[PDB]
Write a protein that binds this ligand. Structure first.
Ligand SMILES: COc1ccc(C(=N)N)cc1
Ligand SMILES: [Ca+2]
Length: 223
């Protein structure tokens, strides 16, 4: 997260860290046994870390639970990042409390102008590299499809939306991948891609979760 703020410990209780020996992606807890992330975060040997603030220090609210199964969206295209969404089933259900809690799936797609909360442990610099140990937050609006398409000609599908600031300075970044965009207490987006980080006229692009709710619900019901 570039140009964000320190969320505060366990203020974003649905945020997960995907760990393969190190943090490599975020995710969202959507019920006690399932995490939603980006398909570009796929790998084998994932440990889901819930209840994190400082990902380098055991602070006492963590749950570390191995993945039993990963399901990449059947139509994920790694070239275009269309359908950049993946489900991860936990080996055992998380213990839900005020600091580890699921986020609701949307019943409706959020409109342009809606203010959302983006969070993650990704890079905090637009030039060079500085990875924070504590969770960062950014409030950002959803941009119009026309501003999103104008920023990324020929690259925005109906399964993507832009959020952030055309002026730059404030964006998600590498390491925020797979993390949540929460609007009005519902998961509306997944950190997917962008051209650099926090660049002028190059907002963040997010998987449009509201297009995937039937796939998510049907998948969870049968797995
Ligand atoms: C490789 O991951 C990302 C994720 C987000 C962004 C961005 N929001 N600019 C860029 C690269
Ligand atoms: Ca920790």
């Amino acid at each position: 997260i570039v140009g964000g703020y320190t969320c505060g410990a366990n203020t974003v209780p649905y945020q997960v860290s995907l760990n393969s020996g190190y943090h490599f992606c975020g995710g969202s807890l959507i019920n006690s046994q399932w995490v939603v992330s980006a398909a570009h975060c796929y790998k084998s040997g994932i440990q889901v870390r819930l209840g994190e603030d400082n990902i380098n220090v055991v602070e006492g609210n963590e749950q570390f639970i191995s993945a039993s199964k990963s399901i990449v969206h059947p139509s994920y295209n790694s070239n275009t990042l269309n359908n950049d969404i993946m489900l991860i089933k936990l080996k055992s259900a998380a213990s839900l409390n005020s600091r580890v809690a699921s986020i609701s799936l949307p019943t409706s797609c959020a409109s342009a102008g809606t203010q959302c909360l983006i969070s993650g442990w990704g890079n905090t610099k637009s030039s060079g590299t500085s990875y924070p140990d504590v969770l960062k937050c950014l409030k950002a609006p959803i941009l119009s499809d026309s501003s999103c398409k104008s920023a990324y000609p020929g690259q925005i599908t109906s399964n993507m939306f832009c959020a952030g600031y055309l002026e730059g300075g404030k964006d998600s970044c590498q390491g925020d991948s797979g993390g949540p965009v929460v609007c009005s207490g519902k998961l509306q987006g997944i950190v997917s891609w962008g051209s650099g980080c926090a660049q002028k006229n190059k907002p963040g692009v997010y998987t449009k979760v509201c297009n995937y709710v039937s796939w998510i619900k049907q998948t969870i019901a049968s797995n």
